[PDB]
Paper text:
Here, we biochemically and structurally characterize a two-component defense system DUF4297–HerA, demonstrating that DUF4297–HerA confers resistance against phage infection by cooperatively cleaving dsDNA and hydrolyzing ATP. DUF4297 encodes a protein containing an N-terminal DUF4297 domain (a putative PD-(D/E)xK-family nuclease) with predicted yet-to-be biochemically characterized nuclease activity and a C-terminal domain (CTD) with unknown function. HerA, widely distributed in archaea and bacteria, encodes a DNA motor protein, which can hydrolyze ATP and translocate along DNA.
We first determined the cryo-EM structure of HerA alone at an overall resolution of 3.14 Å. Unexpectedly, HerA assembles into a split spiral hexamer with a cleft between the topmost and bottommost subunits. Interestingly, HerA alone shows extremely low ATPase activity. Structural comparison immediately explains why the ATPase activity of HerA alone is inhibited. While the pocket created by Walk A and Walk B motifs can accommodate the ATP molecule, relocation of the R finger is needed to hydrolyze ATP because it is too far away (20 Å) from the Walker A motif with which they form the ATPase active site. However, the required conformational change would cause a steric clash at the insertion and four-helix bundle domains, hindering the required movement of the R finger.
Numbering used by the authors:
A (entry chain A): 7 to 569
B (entry chain B): 116 to 569
C (entry chain F): 7 to 28, 36 to 115
D (entry chain E): 458 to 569
């Protein structure tokens, strides 16, 4: 009577009303994205979402408001089936969808134990919107939003709900394992029980870097000759054999890319000792040592690592003075105070097990969420340590699936690696300086689904993320995205959307999301629940520090710290 | 459609009583393209078509029919769909490295960004030379053999040759003299096969000009031979496997014959996935190509029609012209543009059809399209569809689960059909993250994983 | 018709007005005398329609930029917040609450 | 003080930003349908059935509107005593004459 259909397109529904104010009736919020129930007989109804409102004037009668509706699916006695139905006809009665029918959109498709509720529908706050929590996490999540949209609040609420998700048969820590790469030190306030590891406490040993990460940490791609690269991997590979205390048949397995222990100070000696080389008339590099006299052969190249080597030879060597570009480059980095976390003395002393006890937080202080505060990490080595950890967690998950396949009972350690500011590590550009972290994340995306190591891409600029990584995500939680290049990237990459909700991206409210994927029953415009403990990043209060009267007492103290 | 030609796997969506047969002859031999977004049940209609194709049989016998379907599932979905099928993961499939052509043998071993052209020249000089000694035919055919030719070579001997060429020195006569246990000689094309032995001592007081240029080359090659992830392509079993035993495994003609061979490529590393997909696609296409040679001579054809199902077809044959997927795209393109007449057809399956190349997607003739909510997938498919009926191709985002849009030469007319409900659905065994996360903190597991790594 | 929205797109609001005398691209559409509920919209473009049967009316494309409640501004467009429309002298300093409150 | 005067026989080719800034609109007979729709859309003022009179305007009979004039009206511009006539090559007058042959040799020498 009040609302009737006037046209049934293949994709759309044209519904004409005479009074929208009466049409609300229950005072439900009515707008673009609201659900309409179009049926004349109860317990069977077609649910349609609203695309756009319009008006029409017959020039001799009262004006009528016309609603463009997209049929999202039909409900039948508490069962919701997606896709438009044949019940949409012009002689039909349209009304706002009841609470029992909107709830049946989401609650029917997910089992009672599989519901992961972290939000509610934006247009109707009474209905909660659960996601299939198994399918939500096991397929990678892509949380996308512009600044000021509370994207970090959405990331914090999902991880807070996953940590709080527990079974009633015990009280304590559950099996949630989340690793966060925050460059803004933002999520420390969100989780007070988390394990935050910054450069002061994180000790990443350098010897698990592969060939690609070892190149970019130590040498540059512009001013080093091919001879300087050659002598580097000669020293690295030869050092990895003597310190290998295991099977000698596995000693021949070791290459430059292998992640075995080597001593960087002993590598420094080799490039130093080969810098001042001297040749004889027979082109044999005889070396004088406190232990004895020897030539430069493969079977006695390990004793060259000692610092008490005196060069021998009546004439200067072919590569004499050739490595002074190299030795002084790497000697700066070992004693650089900013690389103490990765090239320090603790990197040599720490073992392999204590590294994974730290990154996953299985050591003394076990915590569900391990926060890798990479703010203090230098930007030249940031994409290397991100690539090292992302490789270390994947091969942990890759080797996790080999133990209990034999035993036939799988305890399992699912790991979710949250990449805050995800386009910094995994960019659209194919530059070599971002190359290590791109393929380490791409290995998580393209392969980590089955090994129990998935990823969460939390980024402010989704258009900078590579499509080979962003498309591998399945569930997408898009916050307010207003930039046209970020919208066009996301709108092209979204796997499933109902009609015209995707256009709502620039106009979203704060905390109001746009979630799809295999997990959720239908793409809906949801309002993420407010975080009790918000992820407030501690940052310098510049206006507060401007009005500080210029005490200048601290400067004389600062130079003593520098000296 | 003739009564013996009908292949019914669906009924009409708007009328459940009327079945929708397709010309099953014309349905398969012209390539299919099943397309449908996430949650649309695209994997079920791929499962139902192949379940209908396997059970499609004559009444004169009971047993296996001549269906030969090869499935490329990275998501590991179809293992539960066909319990009688053969499933080959990394741990079971043994693909020989020597069956790769020249294009696939570089991207498995080399990178174009860091390797100088003279470094790569040592690689295919070693492999081409290695491919002649191990070849056991007449010496006239040994002149035919090149780098791109698919014959047996030993990668350990190529490893020695590349490493020995890193030790090249010249004497006063400027000859690359090599000291070997068998004899002392210079580097010549006649006696370069003795350079494959590791017991070769360099000679010459002055090192070569290109000496020491191959350590970035051999160390990249050192890691791949003993990589535990590449054990299926570069292990000891790939050397011992024969050419026949590889083709027995790929179409399941070994001791355990099955209609459907499922290639679980989930464990394949993502850098070598486009190489193993290209290797198998070229092996099967050339199997069907060489199948037509004998059968013409036999004058009565028994035939092995093969349908290769490419689930996630946009990963192997993408629209982007990148050299990483160049090998898998061309192998799929050869099957699409030529395999109609050789009995090797393809089934493209993808949730993102707009990423498949249009040169391969248009070579499909029958398109089964499920729900397409992504607007760029709609615009791509509506452009590439060879047929339509008025305003049924605008029904794409409003299709239900299991309800399809099927066109092409197979069907009498484009229509919105309802695919039959899959009795055995293609469930994928994935880690239920919440169901593990509601459990308590497991701590006995982490100690065991460290011992695996060492 | 003084001022009334005729089309509510997901990101756009089309308002048909009889004449410009009866501002510019990027101006804020504030004609509001309602407490605790209001709609704030910026102007995308000024457009003139061709009807061939009536007087020409200006159609403005309005992007909804926020919603204020009792002096508190929340970003994002909501279509709910314009039930009333009345002509009376109203205040002007409620555009202060867009920037001052946060 | 630097003011312009857009005189053109194809108003629809002129860009809208430049054209709209001018506010006094003197229009002669405009009879291209694409030109008429461009001008009538860009009008600052209008009177119901006088913009449709554009293709029916006489020779020298103009439509002038804008804030300078009091009301839009269909006016007749005064006849020019000395009209702006452009001196051109009278093709049919030259083509009716005899074949000029001495003038071809004179052109090439200037060209060379």
């Amino acid at each position: 009577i009040n609302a009737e259909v006037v046209s049934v397109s293949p994709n759309k529904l044209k519904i004409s009303v005479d009074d929208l104010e009466e049409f609300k009736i229950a005072e439900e919020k009515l707008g673009v994205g609201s659900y309409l129930r179009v049926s004349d007989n109860q317990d069977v109804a077609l649910l349609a979402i609203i695309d756009n409102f319009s008006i029409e004037v017959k020039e001799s009668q009262k004006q009528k408001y016309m609603i463009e509706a997209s049929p999202i699916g039909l409900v039948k006695n508490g069962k919701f089936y997606r896709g438009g139905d044949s019940l949409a006809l012009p002689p039909k009665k349209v009304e706002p969808a009841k609470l029992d029918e909107i709830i049946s959109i989401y609650s029917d498709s997910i089992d009672i134990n599989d519901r992961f509720t972290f939000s509610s529908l934006s247009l109707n706050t009474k209905v909660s919107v659960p996601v299939n929590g198994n399918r939500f996490f096991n397929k990678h999540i892509a949380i996308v939003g512009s600044t000021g949209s509370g994207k970090s609040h959405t990331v914090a609420k999902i991880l807070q709900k996953a940590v709080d998700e527990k079974q009633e048969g015990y009280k304590g820590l559950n099996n949630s394992h989340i690793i966060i790469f925050d460059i803004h030190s933002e999520y420390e306030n969100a989780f007070p029980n988390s394990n935050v590891l910054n450069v002061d406490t994180l000790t990443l040993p350098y010897w698990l870097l592969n060939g690609d990460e070892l190149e970019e940490l130590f040498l540059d791609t512009e001013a080093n000759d091919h001879n300087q690269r050659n002598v580097f991997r000669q020293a690295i590979t030869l050092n990895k054999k003597i310190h290998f205390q295991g099977d000698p048949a596995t000693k021949e397995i070791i290459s430059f890319h292998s992640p075995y222990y080597f001593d960087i100070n002993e590598v420094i000696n080799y490039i130093n000792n080969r810098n001042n080389e001297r040749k004889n008339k027979d082109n044999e590099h005889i070396w004088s040592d406190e232990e004895g006299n020897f030539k430069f052969d493969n079977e006695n190249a390990h004793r060259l690592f000692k610092e008490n080597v005196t060069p021998d030879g009546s004439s200067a060597g072919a590569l004499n003075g050739k490595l002074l570009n190299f030795v002084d480059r790497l000697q700066s980095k070992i004693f650089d105070k900013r690389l103490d976390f990765i090239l320090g003395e603790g990197s040599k002393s720490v073992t392999f097990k204590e590294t994974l006890e730290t990154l996953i937080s299985y050591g003394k202080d076990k915590s569900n969420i391990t926060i890798l505060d990479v703010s203090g990490v230098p930007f030249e080595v940031l994409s290397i340590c991100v690539s090292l950890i992302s490789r270390l967690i994947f091969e942990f998950g890759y080797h996790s699936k080999k133990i209990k396949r034999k035993s036939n009972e799988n305890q399992d350690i699912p790991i979710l690696i949250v990449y805050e500011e995800a386009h910094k590590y995994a960019p659209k550009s194919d530059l070599s300086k971002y190359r290590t972290s791109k393929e380490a994340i791409e290995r998580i995306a393209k392969e980590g689904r089955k090994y129990g190591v998935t990823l969460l891409l939390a980024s402010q600029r989704p258009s900078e993320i590579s499509e080979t990584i962003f498309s591998q995500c399945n569930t997408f939680i898009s916050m307010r995205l207003t930039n046209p290049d970020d919208q066009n990237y996301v709108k092209r990459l979204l796997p499933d959307t109902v009609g015209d909700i995707t256009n709502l991206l620039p106009s979203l409210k704060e905390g109001e999301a746009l979630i799809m994927g295999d997990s959720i029953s239908i793409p809906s415009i949801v309002k993420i629940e407010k975080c009790t403990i918000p992820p407030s990043s501690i940052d310098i209060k510049y206006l507060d520090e401007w009005r500080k009267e210029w005490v200048d007492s601290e400067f004389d103290k600062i130079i003593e710290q520098w000296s």
